[PDB]
Amino acid sequence: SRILAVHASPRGERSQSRRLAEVFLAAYREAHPQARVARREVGRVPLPAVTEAFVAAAFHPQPEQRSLAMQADLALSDQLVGELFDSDLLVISTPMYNFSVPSGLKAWIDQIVRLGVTFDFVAQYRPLLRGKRALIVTSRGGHGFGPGGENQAMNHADPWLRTALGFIGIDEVTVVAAEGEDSCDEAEQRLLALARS
Amino acid sequence: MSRILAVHASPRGERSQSRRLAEVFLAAYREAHPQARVARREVGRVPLPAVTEAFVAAAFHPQPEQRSLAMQADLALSDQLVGELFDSDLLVISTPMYNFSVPSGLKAWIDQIVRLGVTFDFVLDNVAQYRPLLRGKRALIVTSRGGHGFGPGGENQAMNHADPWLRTALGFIGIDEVTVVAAEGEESGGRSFEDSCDEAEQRLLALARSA
Amino acid sequence: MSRILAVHASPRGERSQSRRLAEVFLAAYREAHPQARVARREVGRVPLPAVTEAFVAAAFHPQPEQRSLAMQADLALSDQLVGELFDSDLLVISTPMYNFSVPSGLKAWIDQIVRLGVTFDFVLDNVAQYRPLLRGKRALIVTSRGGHGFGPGGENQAMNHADPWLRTALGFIGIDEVTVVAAEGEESGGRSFEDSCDEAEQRLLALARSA
Amino acid sequence: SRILAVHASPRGERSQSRRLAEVFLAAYREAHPQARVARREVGRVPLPAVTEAFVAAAFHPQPEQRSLAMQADLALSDQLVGELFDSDLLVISTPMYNFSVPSGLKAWIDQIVRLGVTFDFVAQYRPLLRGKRALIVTSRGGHGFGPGGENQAMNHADPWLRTALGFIGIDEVTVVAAEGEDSCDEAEQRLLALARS
Ligand SMILES: Cc1cc2nc3c(=O)[nH]c(=O)nc-3n(C[C@H](O)[C@H](O)[C@H](O)COP(=O)(O)O)c2cc1C
Ligand SMILES: Cc1cc2nc3c(=O)[nH]c(=O)nc-3n(C[C@H](O)[C@H](O)[C@H](O)COP(=O)(O)O)c2cc1C
Ligand SMILES: Cc1cc2nc3c(=O)[nH]c(=O)nc-3n(C[C@H](O)[C@H](O)[C@H](O)COP(=O)(O)O)c2cc1C
Ligand SMILES: Cc1cc2nc3c(=O)[nH]c(=O)nc-3n(C[C@H](O)[C@H](O)[C@H](O)COP(=O)(O)O)c2cc1C
Ligand SMILES: NC(=O)N/N=C/c1ccc([N+](=O)[O-])o1
Ligand SMILES: NC(=O)N/N=C/c1ccc([N+](=O)[O-])o1
Ligand SMILES: NC(=O)N/N=C/c1ccc([N+](=O)[O-])o1
Ligand SMILES: NC(=O)N/N=C/c1ccc([N+](=O)[O-])o1
């Protein structure tokens, strides 16, 4: 059982989403002693944004012909994609920042959605990832951003992740949210339950 | 004469359609308002710093005037970015749709300019109650998308977390007069994209002539 | 009353000795010159963009006035950084020694402000002949090092590629009046570092009182 | 024979140092068909600068006690160091930018000089890398920056690299420089000779 854990909060010890995610990971490890966890930090480390060079390389009509410089432009992307390919369960921890996700997490997504690698087209688009599942652990300052919540329509954090993840083939996605920064305890207890299965 | 702040979020240069269309609007605006001020803030071709833990600590410091000089340094870019907004009457954001949202640099720009006590505030009616601090401003969002149907009524409307999300974040700080001009079909190109770009230009020219 | 530009290159905040010592100088300068302008440019706690290929293409464009708007965007930060320098009479750089040189952010700041036709130029006496374009400026470099002997006469002088290198880069654009104030022994601390910091402060106070 | 190639120019096809380095690498591969080359791009990709968090983690008095967040702060560094450990020959290509190296290369060095990993102290310092050699391939706009050159004392590019590399244990270092951007041809031919041995 291989887990990729992507932490999106820039905060360390003080991060609630990171802490909850780590509570899940620890419980998961207890119940699956053989598990491996890979951590990809995108909160405390400045992940590069997509550049024009990246666009030219990633959408190259004949990728086998990419120059060495273009391959260099894609090397981080390839590494990030590889972590995803090698994992069965993707865990993403993230704050809501301004009704969406921290910019580093947007940057991660922008690196791993890759034509001919995690999606393709025939234009109609097709996902290429299979057999993967994801758990999103998110913390929010306010309230009512969840399903049936008063502010659901303002939530462009996790519902957006579902869209992007869905596009590349990850369609089994669970969200666990703590709001009001009781809800945390319900999340933590929800996570322990999820981990022991 | 509205003072304009243009925020360009495509990493692409001459080839950016979102940038190009926004520049059509700005030039046309300039023609009708020779003395109007236009400031440009690049967030696409320039890596804009993400929000860090030090930024959070400074921005949310309970006694703001007591921030160390180091903390002030952590907010210096934010202060510059916010200042540009305060100086402007009309905000123009040019942006691609990247993976059903905006490029990460634009997200980072937003994260820098939503500032407690500066562009929004709150009181405790225990239950924090938020209030926007920007007034008298308007925004124009000029966007380009590879595919089709991300606009209202579109087959893929629910997947659109780019401009609808921008409208929400801007509304939070008090910019609720927001217009969206979108070109679609950029990936397929053809003459359907030419028409879409043509319509976008005509729309932008009308807007510029009346702003 | 010299206008001052302070460029802080340590990633550390309250704990930065190089920053602290420079702030001692600035405060003391302020006390003697209440109306003096002081601008701070953070290059340590803020990731400053490296020079890119697009920057090179724009900065070295043979017809500069013909740069596209995208190219101008590529130089916008550089223009801001250069402008700060032009506005100043005295430049104060605070910097650690990091691996026998300066932190990468400070190197990036330098790479942004050495600009053809702006802070230096050249003619072809074929064999390019360079000329600095900054005049009437002075620099003060305040530095802190973990070890000892990196100064003149020091056992490790030849390993020092921090301030001696800064002096060379600044000289290239026309700042040849450069003073270096160094504290050493920061890693060992003890009372040898206390003395070194004390001497640095006394030196900086004298400089501030006469600048 | 394992090679780590660190390219420092932000320029792609147009980069002279990159091109010369690749001429060497190709020739080296011809003569040592079993060779492996790892490429670490630090010119066209924004390598993060050392931060206060990095300092706190890297100089932690009791590293085995580092929190997960601190380990995250060091994960890139650990990866960069690992590439170095796994290599026999380090090749660095770099422009001279303002009498030194591009800032990305300074940032790389700042990630790989690591207490207890590539150097230690007993204070007296001690290198920890062994059996490695390096080749620096550098391109300069001007002239006379080499040994015995009129401008030698202004050169804080490769002579500085020697210092930093020397500090962690890489003391067999060769510099091949092209100046005046004939010298290139002499470098290229110098590189082919070096590669066939
Ligand atoms: C820059 C920033 C933006 C935020 N935006 C929102 C928001 O849009 N909606 C919300 O409910 N809370 C918002 N918050 C509050 C955080 O979501 C809340 O503190 C969350 O628990 C932080 O996650 P973390 O503990 O993992 O760092 C924001 C906080 C910060 C620092
Ligand atoms: C990294 C990347 C992600 C993209 N994601 C989407 C997308 O999610 N939906 C879509 O319709 N088009 C998408 N596109 C296509 C672009 O939106 C389209 O090419 C757009 O014109 C780019 O804006 P620009 O021309 O101003 O640079 C994407 C393009 C890139 C390079
Ligand atoms: C990444 C790093 C590299 C360093 N390299 C050197 C060095 O090469 N020589 C030296 O004497 N001290 C070195 N030091 C020690 C620092 O120069 C010293 O702690 C200095 O005070 C840092 O400056 P600051 O206090 O303003 O942050 C290094 C420290 C760090 C964190
Ligand atoms: C930002 C910048 C700084 C430079 N600084 C120097 C310098 O200090 N001394 C020098 O001789 N040439 C300098 N040059 C010229 C370059 O070193 C020369 O173009 C070199 O061949 C570029 O390397 P590359 O072809 O691998 O990109 C500089 C060039 C640039 C773009
Ligand atoms: N009910 C709400 O609108 N809650 N919003 C919380 C937010 C949004 C932005 C921030 N912020 O601190 O930046 O807090
Ligand atoms: N989803 C669509 O129908 N059209 N958009 C095309 C996309 C989506 C993602 C990307 N991408 O390049 O990452 O292109
Ligand atoms: N070289 C010395 O004698 N003292 N300096 C200490 C150093 C050198 C490099 C580092 N470092 O932390 O990377 O510390
Ligand atoms: N003989 C010289 O001083 N040569 N210097 C060349 C340089 C230094 C900086 C630049 N530059 O283009 O930035 O070129």
Sign of CA dihedral A53, A57, A58, A61: positive
Distance (Å, rounded) from C-alpha C179 to C-alpha C167? Answer: 9
| Ligand that comes closest to the CA of residue B93 | 2
Distance of CA C109 to the CA centre of its chain: 8
Q: At D40, which amino acid appears?
A: R
Tell whether B20 lies on the interface with C, counting CB pairs under 8 A.
no
Distance of CA C131 to the CA centre of its chain: 20
Distance (Å, rounded) from C-alpha B181 to C-alpha B157? Answer: 15
Q: Which two tokens stand for residue A25?
A: 């990971």
C75, with CB counted inside 10 A (0-12, 13-18, 19+), is buried
Could you say which of A10, A50, A98 has the minimum Cβ distance to residue B169? A98
| Ligand 5 within 6 A of CB of A141 | yes
Tell whether C71 lies on the interface with B, counting CB pairs under 8 A.
yes
Q: In terms of Cα–Cα distance, which of D175, C78, C13, C82 is closest to B74?
A: C13
| Ligand that comes closest to the CA of residue A110 | 2
Q: Which two tokens stand for residue D165?
A: 């590399």
Contact status, residue A196 vs residue A31, Cβ threshold 8 Å: yes
| Chain D residues close to C45, C-beta within 8 Å | 51-52
Cross-chain residue pair B13–C70, CB shorter than 8 Å = yes
Question: Which residues pair with residue C5 across a beta bridge?
Answer: C39, C91
Rounded to 10°, the helix D16-31/D183-195 angle is 30
Q: Which residues contact D185 (CB under 8 A, 6 or more apart)?
A: none
DSSP C121: E
**A–D: how many Cβ contacts below 8 A?**
55
Dmax (CA) of chain A? 56
Distance (Å, rounded) from C-alpha D186 to C-alpha D194? Answer: 12
Domains in chain D with CATH codes? 1-197 (3.40.50.360)
Name all chains with 3 or more CB-CB pairs below 8 Å to chain C: B, D
Tell whether D19 lies on the interface with A, counting CB pairs under 8 A.
no
Tell whether C83 lies on the interface with B, counting CB pairs under 8 A.
no
Question: Which residues pair with residue D79 across a beta bridge?
Answer: none
Helix (H) or strand (E) holding B7: strand B4-8
B203 annotated ligand binder: no
Q: Which two tokens stand for residue A20?
A: 């909850």
Distance of CA A187 to the CA centre of its chain: 18
SS3 content of chain A, % helix, strand, coil (to 5): 40, 20, 35
Q: Give me the long-range contacts of C82-87 (CB less than 8 A, separation at least 24).
A: C82/C112, C82/C113, C82/C115, C82/C118, C82/C119, C84/C5, C84/C39, C84/C41, C85/C5, C85/C113, C85/C119, C85/C134, C85/C137, C86/C134, C87/C3, C87/C5, C87/C39
Other Cβ atoms less than 10 A from the Cβ of C136: the count is: 8
Cross-chain residue pair D70–A12, CB shorter than 8 Å = yes
Helix (H) or strand (E) holding D94: strand D89-95
Q: Which two tokens stand for residue B101?
A: 């949202």
Least Cα separation, residue A193 to chain B (angstroms): 30
Beta-sheet pairing, A89-95 with A133-140: parallel
First to last CA, chain C: 9
Burial code (b: 16+ CB inside 10 Å, e: under 16) for B92-115 equals: bbbbbbbbbbbbbbbbbbbbbbbb
Q: Which value, in Å, is the radius of gyration of the alpha carbons in chain D? A: 17
Q: What is the number of H-type helices and E-type strands within chain B?
A: 6, 7
Q: In angstroms, what CA-CA distances link A195 with A17, A22, C108, D152? A: 16, 11, 46, 63
**E-assigned strand segments in chain C:** 4-8, 38-42, 90-96, 120-124, 128-132, 138-144, 177-183
Grouping H, G, I as helix, E, B as strand and the rest as coil, residue B123 is strand
Q: What is the number of H-type helices and E-type strands within chain A?
A: 6, 7
- Technique behind this structure? X-ray
Residue C70 CA to ligand 2 center (angstroms) comes to 18
Q: Which two tokens stand for residue B21?
A: 């269309």
Could you say which of D52, D102, D154 has the minimum Cβ distance to residue C168? D154
Count of all residues that appear for chain A in the document: 197
| Ligand 8 within 6 A of CB of D151 | yes
| Ligand 4 within 6 A of CB of C50 | no
Contact status, residue B25 vs residue B92, Cβ threshold 8 Å: yes
Distance (Å, rounded) from C-alpha A64 to C-alpha A53? Answer: 16
Q: Report the phi/psi class of residue C136: left, alpha or beta, with left for phi > 0 and alpha for psi in -120 to 50.
A: left
Question: Which residues pair with residue D127 across a beta bridge?
Answer: D119
Distance (Å, rounded) from C-alpha D27 to C-alpha D25? Answer: 5
| Ligand 4 within 6 A of CB of D95 | yes
Beta-sheet pairing, A172-179 with B4-8: unpaired
Q: At D137, which amino acid appears?
A: V
**CA atoms within 13 Å, Cβ hemisphere of D95:** 24
Q: At C18, which amino acid appears?
A: S
Q: In terms of Cα–Cα distance, which of D117, D126, D128 is closest to D63?
A: D117
Question: Which residues pair with residue A93 across a beta bridge?
Answer: A7, A137
B101 annotated ligand binder: no
| Ligand 4 within 6 A of CB of D100 | no
Q: At C6, which amino acid appears?
A: A
Q: In terms of Cα–Cα distance, which of B199, B181, B168 is closest to B92?
A: B181
**E-assigned strand segments in C89-204:** 90-96, 120-124, 128-132, 138-144, 177-183
Q: Which residues contact C197 (CB under 8 A, 6 or more apart)?
A: C17, C21, C183
Grouping H, G, I as helix, E, B as strand and the rest as coil, residue C51 is coil
Sign of CA dihedral D109, D111, D112, D114: positive
- Looking from the CA of residue B184, the nearest atom of ligand 2 is 11
Rounded to 10°, the helix C104-113/C69-87 angle is 100
Q: In terms of Cα–Cα distance, which of D103, D164, D111 is closest to D136?
A: D164
Distance of CA B97 to the CA centre of its chain: 13
Burial code (b: 16+ CB inside 10 Å, e: under 16) for B153-174 equals: ebeeeebbbbbbbbbbbbbbbb
- Looking from the CA of residue A110, the nearest atom of ligand 6 is 13
Grouping H, G, I as helix, E, B as strand and the rest as coil, residue A109 is helix
Window 92-111 of B: residues touching A by CB (8 A cutoff) are 98-105, 107-108, 110-111
Rounded to 10°, the helix A103-112/A158-168 angle is 10
Distance (Å, rounded) from C-alpha A80 to C-alpha A47? Answer: 11
Other Cβ atoms less than 10 A from the Cβ of D61: the count is: 5
SS3 content of chain C, % helix, strand, coil (to 5): 45, 20, 35
**Phi and psi torsions of D119, nearest 5°:** -150, 160
Q: Which value, in Å, is the radius of gyration of the alpha carbons in chain A? A: 17
Contact status, residue B122 vs residue B130, Cβ threshold 8 Å: yes
Q: In terms of Cα–Cα distance, which of B135, B143, B194 is closest to B20?
A: B143
Contact status, residue D11 vs residue A68, Cβ threshold 8 Å: no
**Phi and psi torsions of C85, nearest 5°:** -65, -50
Q: In angstroms, what CA-CA distances link A45 with A9, B72, C205, D77? A: 10, 21, 38, 11
Helix (H) or strand (E) holding D126: strand D125-127
| Chain D residues close to C145, C-beta within 8 Å | none
Rounded to 10°, the helix B104-113/B163-173 angle is 10
